[PDB]
Amino acid sequence: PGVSVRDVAAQDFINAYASFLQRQGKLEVPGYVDIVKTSSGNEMPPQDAEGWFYKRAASVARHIYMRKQVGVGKLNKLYGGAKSRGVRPYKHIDASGSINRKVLQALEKIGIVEISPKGGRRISENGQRDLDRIAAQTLEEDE
Amino acid sequence: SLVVQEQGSFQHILRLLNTNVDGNIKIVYALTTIKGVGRRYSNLVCKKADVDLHKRAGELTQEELERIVQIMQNPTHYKIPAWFLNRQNDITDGKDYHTLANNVESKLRDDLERLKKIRAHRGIRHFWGLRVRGQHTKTTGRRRA
Amino acid sequence: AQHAVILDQEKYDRILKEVPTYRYVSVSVLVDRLKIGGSLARIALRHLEKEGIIKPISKHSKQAIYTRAT
Amino acid sequence: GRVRTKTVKRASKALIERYYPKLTLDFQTNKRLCDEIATIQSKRLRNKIAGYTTHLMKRIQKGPVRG
Amino acid sequence: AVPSVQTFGKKKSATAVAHVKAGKGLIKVNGSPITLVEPEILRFKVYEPLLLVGLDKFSNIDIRVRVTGGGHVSQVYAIRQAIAKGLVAYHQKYVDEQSKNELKKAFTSYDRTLLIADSRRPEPKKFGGKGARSRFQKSYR
Amino acid sequence: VLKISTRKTPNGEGSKTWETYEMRIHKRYIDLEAPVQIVKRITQITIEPGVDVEVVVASN
Amino acid sequence: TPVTLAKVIKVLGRTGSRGGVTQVRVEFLEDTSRTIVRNVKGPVRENDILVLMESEREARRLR
Amino acid sequence: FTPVVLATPIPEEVQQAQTEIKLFNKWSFEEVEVKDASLVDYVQVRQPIFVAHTAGRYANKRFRKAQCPIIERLTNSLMMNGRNNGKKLKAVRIIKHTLDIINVLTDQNPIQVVVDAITNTGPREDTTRVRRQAVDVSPLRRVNQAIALLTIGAREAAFRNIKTIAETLAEELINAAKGSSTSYAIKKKDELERVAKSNR
Amino acid sequence: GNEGAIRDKTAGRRNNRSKDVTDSATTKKSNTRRATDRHSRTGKTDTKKKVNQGW
Amino acid sequence: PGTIVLYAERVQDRGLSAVAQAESMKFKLLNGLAIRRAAYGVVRYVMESGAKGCEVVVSGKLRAARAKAMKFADGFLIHS
RNA sequence: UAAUUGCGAUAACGAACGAGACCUUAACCUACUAAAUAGUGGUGCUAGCAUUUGCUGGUUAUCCACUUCUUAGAGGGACUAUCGGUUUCAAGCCGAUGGAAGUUUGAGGCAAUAACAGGUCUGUGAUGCCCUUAGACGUUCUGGGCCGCACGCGCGCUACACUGACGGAGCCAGCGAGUCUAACCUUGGCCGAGAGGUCUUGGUAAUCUUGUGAAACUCCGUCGUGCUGGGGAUAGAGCAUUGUAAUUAUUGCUCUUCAACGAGGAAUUCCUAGUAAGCGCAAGUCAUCAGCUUGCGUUGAUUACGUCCCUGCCCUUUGUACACACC
Ligand SMILES: [Mg+2]
Ligand SMILES: [Mg+2]
Ligand SMILES: [Mg+2]
Ligand SMILES: [Mg+2]
Ligand SMILES: [Mg+2]
Ligand SMILES: [Mg+2]
Ligand SMILES: [Mg+2]
Ligand SMILES: [Mg+2]
Ligand SMILES: [Mg+2]
Ligand SMILES: [Mg+2]
Ligand SMILES: [Mg+2]
Ligand SMILES: [Mg+2]
Ligand SMILES: [Mg+2]
Ligand SMILES: [Mg+2]
Ligand SMILES: [Mg+2]
Ligand SMILES: [Mg+2]
Ligand SMILES: [Mg+2]
Ligand SMILES: [Mg+2]
Ligand SMILES: [Mg+2]
Ligand SMILES: [Mg+2]
Ligand SMILES: [Mg+2]
Ligand SMILES: [Mg+2]
């Protein structure tokens, strides 16, 4: 038929890419993932705790692919949410600027993103291959 | 997850660190009933000590909990960041410590009494039992002293 | 912190013969019987689903509705 | 709650007074007529005037009317 | 160049501009299929045009839309409405009238803003209270 | 739209009544195809007290 | 539980001090042609139907 | 059912719920009927609707509120207490669930047990501050009040308790299908009319 | 000084909570000079054959 | 120097530009005219000066501790 | 009738101010004018999956055409239209159809005559008079204070949770602003858990910051009714930024400490449709500081569409010795 990323259900697609990046082996985790709650705007770290770098590493590329170019700042703002300033009103603050910078770096070394001109990081070509075949198996879930 | 069944493994009551712990509660949260503990400080140490937080607080292997206690009593020698604790550059030995259970209650007064002994304004404030961080006291904090 | 939020070895017998005769099932339906706390209750449902106990008339989380094995 | 002001009623009465051969009972024609027969100052104003002019012209062909 | 039109839909500040080409009967808003949007429970509100007029009704057209502004429900209400007049304008130019009148009547008899360009808008707040009609609390000494 | 919201009373008494002032700006641009001598004949009266006429050419 | 069936034919007006109640003449379509005047609490229109539980009673203007 | 195919995949479930007799996303809309002469013409149904989310102005004119799909007007009565003002979608999901439940045990289609629940919670008569005076409430304040009492009671039960809002609402309306002396609505209604006698 | 502020007793929420509230706390406006407004207190008037010369 | 120069332009029908008349009222009452005399003079000047309507108000005190306020208007005048 | 808005009665007839008109904003134009500082289709050039020709992107101009979407100029459009119901069958009102729109179309702007010892000499180099003027009440510098805390009142912010907090994940607005003698709005690359730092860049702006990827909300999990993970006051220890200066802690982050608060007495506020309410955002303020305000959009109800009982205010009639007008 010919599959594409837009033709897959976001949640069960990114989670599939997560289970794949998970059982592949080349990760390049910065090693510091025991603590960070992914933003100051949040209260506690993600619950997966063996992984979830892959889940963020699925959301890392789905987004950057659907868009021409993006930047670490834009990703912080995207994932960042409302931060309970205790007794003060809720406000939205950007997420971590490093767990994002090196969530890309760690997989650019794995070649799924390229440092785009104009500033930013465009979707990779071999990544443009590491594309929708993944969606093919996704659809295989409903074969 | 996945359903499990312990024969008699899990003991409900368990006191350690001179602090009680509920058996029927999860071990990543059951630990936080001690002083100087945190829902994050405990989270980290748990798999730093290689425990699976998915289940309750008592099934836990005895040796596993002694390893944990060691981790907290020796957190920097066992790869814990120097900005994750409440006692960095403590005040007299440029050391980075963590105050736990019975010792935090003490350290609080250690610092308090220092402030008083040195006559710092915030020390005077505390002795008088007022607010130290400079908040407006006119309309706030009126009936609990 | 009350009434066996944990395994309850001789309760694992109760669950199996308890599920029949029910037209509804849910985490609430479980703790509703002087039983296992929600954390370890919510997790049992699919464990039973594995072999002909229920019929999953519901779809998503925060609400689950299975039914008598047919 | 729209009771036309007497400015409009005034002008419309003064018009049934001089343009009966003209001013057919359908609004659109009366509007296009006033655009050339009266010095009105606003579209909506002349629409109100014309719509009234039409209602008056509509019922006098049923009976009489004051003024 | 093939027979095709362009229409739109507007709910709140949302805008859904749609193009319909004479084709294989493929439909996808923003580049993804209509299979899933998720305002999931609200997806049937856009599945409705298909089933209302009889669902085949697409074997020689092509639907795809983009939506700016609005919100998670503003756009979902604006796009269904952006496709309804898409199909009507198509039967206006390329197809006969009778079939079109049939469609616009089958729509008008069910339509929830399907063809009516909902006029509601946000009212502007006035000093005296953070809200359109609400006023700050009073004291009376 | 240049808005200016301010209280009407010079003092702070009475009803806390606000007032929004406005100033509307219009800047229209054209790209022309003219010669080297009509360069300043459009600088002659094409003026109207109150319009800012700015013209320079470039592609870089 | 003997019930009734009354259909309003004309509307009377707003009774009661606050004005939230309304007098209305009702009409039973079971043994029709009869007269009865009851008062309501909710908002009503012409032609609605209500059911009386005590058919032999009728209040009047309320203070 | 004369299936039709195209390029994008439209699931056969969807390919089944079309012009073929109209149901809810999964519940039949015909055969639902008011079993009480009163409130007929005031319980809008058939006018089938697959999901209760309709951006229809129901207050621009007084009585058009009666032409609104009842299950929807019933759903609008959940986005209450500020904490829920808005949250329409979260509500819509709670209702699709709720009926996923009323039918859990009651075989009777949910779009019918709903009418059965509204029937037994409309106070035939009430009282007003003259002592008090016996007064017959209108056929639409009848419904409005029925929906209001049913939802406040279910919302009352869902608070401080594990049971979900959908479960409490389902059990409340099942008891209200034909009063069983247990729904907060049967109780309140019966006692809002047991005092209309106090003034007679 | 600071030593005096701490050593010095009579200070502290304790030493104040032990005491009673001056009833002047719950006092009000007192409406001073809001009922005599219309009666000019200047003890002076304006001559009519002064105003007529002015206006 | 040369970036600007100003030239004086006599004003047509001064009796229609408000400021022109207000300054006159000022510069006559400052010379000692009767308040009513000067006010009525400027209002009828403005009338014989074409303007379809005119009005002048004087507020404040003139030899009387209490401040008064008098209006002087003639012709037609719109305010909404 | 919203209206001294009109119908009608009429010793009055015909007019004017004010209401209306008018102006502005939001809604409607596939009809006019056309725009690489807006965008659409084709086509070059180009990337992936499938392959049958499809499906999804890249490309500051590769070219060709257009103005639906965007923008703002000119027109048009509604006048409560048509039909009916009601009524002195009058002004009008009510229902239905049609309609972008039929609640003054929604929202504002403007707004006469008079009245107050209403507030403002602490906005004014507006000002009368009085006070002071070299040990100054002028003025500047240094430090403190306006925050001071047994209590009383008022506008508010966060909550007491399971229509939830939490953790991933899906991810959509609209009003604005923004740096020259300059340090304003900031993309992107690295370093940092964070706050933040550092290296460059676009922008005097529909061109760059920005699709402001906001928040609620949607989805999938972890929790389990127990002050619980709800809740985040108080408090210790450290790291940052603004600033000549942060002590009485400007603000930010990290860890730890884990109160009251289990729906609120007597009372009282605001509100009728994209309104209430929840939700966040821009602007004013601003070196730093919003729990404030002015606007914005986001999700979006319940219940009225009545009356004069409460309350307030108007209007007649009436009494009056008040007219400096019941102070
Ligand atoms: Mg977000
Ligand atoms: Mg998120
Ligand atoms: Mg909070
Ligand atoms: Mg603790
Ligand atoms: Mg909240
Ligand atoms: Mg006028
Ligand atoms: Mg256009
Ligand atoms: Mg209609
Ligand atoms: Mg005074
Ligand atoms: Mg002044
Ligand atoms: Mg002065
Ligand atoms: Mg102050
Ligand atoms: Mg206030
Ligand atoms: Mg969440
Ligand atoms: Mg570090
Ligand atoms: Mg530059
Ligand atoms: Mg707790
Ligand atoms: Mg918390
Ligand atoms: Mg309450
Ligand atoms: Mg600010
Ligand atoms: Mg302020
Ligand atoms: Mg008299």
mmCIF file of N, CA, C and O (backbone and C1' of nucleotides) and ligand atoms in Angstrom, chain E residues 136-139, chain F residues 16, chain K residues 154-156 293, ligand 13:
data_model
loop_
_atom_site.group_PDB
_atom_site.id
_atom_site.type_symbol
_atom_site.label_atom_id
_atom_site.label_comp_id
_atom_site.label_asym_id
_atom_site.label_seq_id
_atom_site.Cartn_x
_atom_site.Cartn_y
_atom_site.Cartn_z
ATOM 1 N N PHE E 136 -16.104 42.813 39.946
ATOM 2 C CA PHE E 136 -15.372 42.478 41.155
ATOM 3 C C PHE E 136 -16.332 42.494 42.339
ATOM 4 O O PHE E 136 -17.367 43.166 42.318
ATOM 5 N N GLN E 137 -15.984 41.738 43.376
ATOM 6 C CA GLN E 137 -16.834 41.679 44.556
ATOM 7 C C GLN E 137 -16.924 43.052 45.205
ATOM 8 O O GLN E 137 -15.949 43.807 45.239
ATOM 9 N N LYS E 138 -18.102 43.377 45.726
ATOM 10 C CA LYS E 138 -18.295 44.662 46.375
ATOM 11 C C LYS E 138 -18.269 44.459 47.882
ATOM 12 O O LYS E 138 -18.363 43.337 48.385
ATOM 13 N N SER E 139 -18.120 45.565 48.606
ATOM 14 C CA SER E 139 -17.986 45.521 50.054
ATOM 15 C C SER E 139 -19.178 46.040 50.844
ATOM 16 O O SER E 139 -19.629 45.362 51.773
ATOM 17 N N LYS F 16 -13.287 53.193 39.936
ATOM 18 C CA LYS F 16 -12.045 52.910 39.220
ATOM 19 C C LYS F 16 -12.379 52.741 37.739
ATOM 20 O O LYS F 16 -12.446 51.638 37.190
ATOM 21 P P G K 154 -14.959 41.814 56.285
ATOM 22 O "O5'" G K 154 -14.317 42.430 54.963
ATOM 23 C "C5'" G K 154 -14.926 43.534 54.310
ATOM 24 C "C4'" G K 154 -14.036 44.122 53.244
ATOM 25 C "C3'" G K 154 -13.571 43.177 52.148
ATOM 26 O "O3'" G K 154 -14.558 42.911 51.168
ATOM 27 C "C1'" G K 154 -11.741 44.445 52.896
ATOM 28 P P C K 155 -14.476 41.556 50.307
ATOM 29 O "O5'" C K 155 -13.336 41.854 49.230
ATOM 30 C "C5'" C K 155 -13.434 42.984 48.375
ATOM 31 C "C4'" C K 155 -12.248 43.119 47.451
ATOM 32 C "C3'" C K 155 -11.809 41.877 46.700
ATOM 33 O "O3'" C K 155 -12.664 41.539 45.620
ATOM 34 C "C1'" C K 155 -9.910 43.038 47.491
ATOM 35 P P G K 156 -12.644 40.054 45.004
ATOM 36 O "O5'" G K 156 -11.106 39.796 44.673
ATOM 37 C "C5'" G K 156 -10.535 38.501 44.770
ATOM 38 C "C4'" G K 156 -9.028 38.569 44.812
ATOM 39 C "C3'" G K 156 -8.301 37.239 44.677
ATOM 40 O "O3'" G K 156 -8.145 36.854 43.322
ATOM 41 C "C1'" G K 156 -7.391 38.475 46.490
ATOM 42 P P U K 293 -7.364 42.366 40.009
ATOM 43 O "O5'" U K 293 -7.241 43.527 38.922
ATOM 44 C "C5'" U K 293 -7.513 44.880 39.261
ATOM 45 C "C4'" U K 293 -6.880 45.836 38.280
ATOM 46 C "C3'" U K 293 -7.341 45.713 36.837
ATOM 47 O "O3'" U K 293 -8.563 46.388 36.595
ATOM 48 C "C1'" U K 293 -4.981 45.830 36.903
HETATM 49 MG MG MG L 13 -11.934 46.335 44.780
#
